[PDB]
Design a protein around this ligand. Structure first.
Ligand SMILES: *Cc1c(COP(=O)(O)O)cnc(C)c1O
Ligand SMILES: *Cc1c(COP(=O)(O)O)cnc(C)c1O
Lengths: 279, 284
């Protein structure tokens, strides 16, 4: 019932989701149409605000996370900022572990949103190069803190409410905003929550909607070169500065539009995942 | 436009980044300020370049087009290292105007990243008196001289933000009216810092027409002063209590608004509105 346009937004939680669906009609002038969800307009400037809100809100509803108790996650990425935002508003202490090998830039927003950032010594890597063993040491620090404090472990890769977020919000919004006119959806996979949750909802509304995973070097392959080139083109043609994964989603969507696999007049929807300012 | 729009951002399709400019949320900072009275703030960090400058950027380009000073597909030039250069880059990108920007080599290269990502042609100009980190009056004057030379050859429209009347107009026609609508006419005080002064002058002029009793304050580094330490402290508290990462000028705005609420100068149940000017991500 919140009116963001003509009323008061009660908290940052009300800024999560209901993102614009922008038409990229200058980047792709036809035939057919390319549209993308503006997930860079979430309060921490990534789609992770949706999964962060769900994982914390559902842990609270189930009674697994009690009023004012501590939360822990291992991350260097957008999910840390998202959880920090939601825990800040809801009054949960938040601890985050990440390798000292990450750029200090990766901690700035999480720390500004009240996260207790624990930098964990690299085991095998050097600065700018966080290895599997570096991350395994940050996971081990987080499990030790969790055992010592009874903190709620968010467990982004194994938490089912991650994909529920996109099934209940992202999917329904796209369906509403297109008034059901959508031939294809595509996005890359980290947790896979956005792809799995959105696609499940869209396929329930229209089973003929074609859902594609964008796979970095059913699926569309994209190189770092394509991601970079289309990140730049999105900025030059649409005035939107997004991250590398957004560049790959645009490159993939344009390959799909030219493929002739869809009708000539196809409407294709993807995701603008985050702000280019997060890099 | 921003004022004649039938675009439904929530339940329909947003035609372009231009339609993302303005109509920003007015957020209640009820955890940072639990009462009595209320602190609210415009989320200008949710503009497409993550600053309030998208509003003045759109007005300056659209009015130059309307007047016939800037013709279809013609070039634009500005001297800037700031949020204004990102805003003008966004608007020129969508509207199909080649955009050139000169700035001193004394600026952090971070200041050019977004402008360049949005297709601005960034020309870096040799410092005349200053050192890296320290851009002087003469360093800036040399950037202006480079831009005037390029403008002589290209006939580019010069934005000239500090002398452009449409700068103020943007806030009189958009920011003020939005705040008045979003509060349903409940506002006892408005405050913001001054750069160009466009936001303060435009917003305050509108609010005073709607409610002559409204008190308008300039935030200075009448008026409310804040130390660097206060701006930093309240930037941190805005993040910790409200989950919003904004720039240093936003910290200054919140410190001033909290000082005003605590002063007892306004009624106990006063509603105070300020501006969350930009994202903390635009800094190091
Ligand atoms: C998380 C993330 C993704 C992938 O989203 P999942 O729902 O985790 O699969 C893509 N791009 C960016 C920038 C992300 O932060
Ligand atoms: C320009 C700017 C201001 C001041 O706004 P004016 O309308 O130019 O006075 C405040 N904060 C930020 C971040 C700005 O970029």
């Amino acid at each position: 019932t919140v009116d963001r346009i003509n009323g008061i937004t009660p908290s940052a939680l009300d800024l999560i989701g209901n993102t614009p669906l922008i038409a990229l009609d200058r980047l792709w002038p036809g035939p057919g149409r390319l549209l993308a969800k503006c997930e860079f307009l979430n309060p921490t400037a990534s789609l992770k605000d949706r999964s962060s809100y769900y994982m914390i809100a559902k842990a609270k509803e189930s009674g697994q996370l009690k009023d004012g108790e501590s939360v822990i996650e291992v991350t260097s990425g957008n999910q840390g900022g998202g959880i920090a935002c939601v825990t800040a508003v809801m009054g949960h202490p938040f601890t985050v572990t990440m390798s000292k090998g990450n750029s200090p830039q990766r901690a700035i927003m999480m720390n500004a949103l009240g996260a207790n950032v624990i930098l964990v010594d690299q085991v095998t890597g050097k600065p700018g190069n966080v290895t599997a063993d570096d991350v395994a040491a940050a996971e081990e620090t987080a499990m030790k803190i969790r055992e010592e404090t009874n903190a709620y472990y968010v467990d982004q890769f194994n938490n089912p409410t991650n994909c529920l977020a996109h099934y209940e919000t992202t999917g329904p919004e796209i369906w509403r905003q297109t008034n059901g006119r959508i031939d294809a959806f595509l996005v890359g996979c980290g947790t896979g929550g956005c792809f799995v949750g959105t696609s499940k909802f869209l396929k329930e509304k229209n089973p003929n909607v074609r859902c594609f995973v964008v796979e970095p070097e059913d699926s569309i392959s994209v190189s770092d070169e394509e991601a970079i080139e289309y990140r730049k083109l999105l900025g030059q043609k649409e005035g939107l500065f997004c991250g590398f994964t957004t560049g790959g989603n645009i490159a993939a969507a344009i390959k799909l539009l030219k493929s002739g696999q869809l009708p000539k007049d196809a409407w294709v929807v993807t995701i603008l995942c985050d702000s280019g300012l997060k890099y």
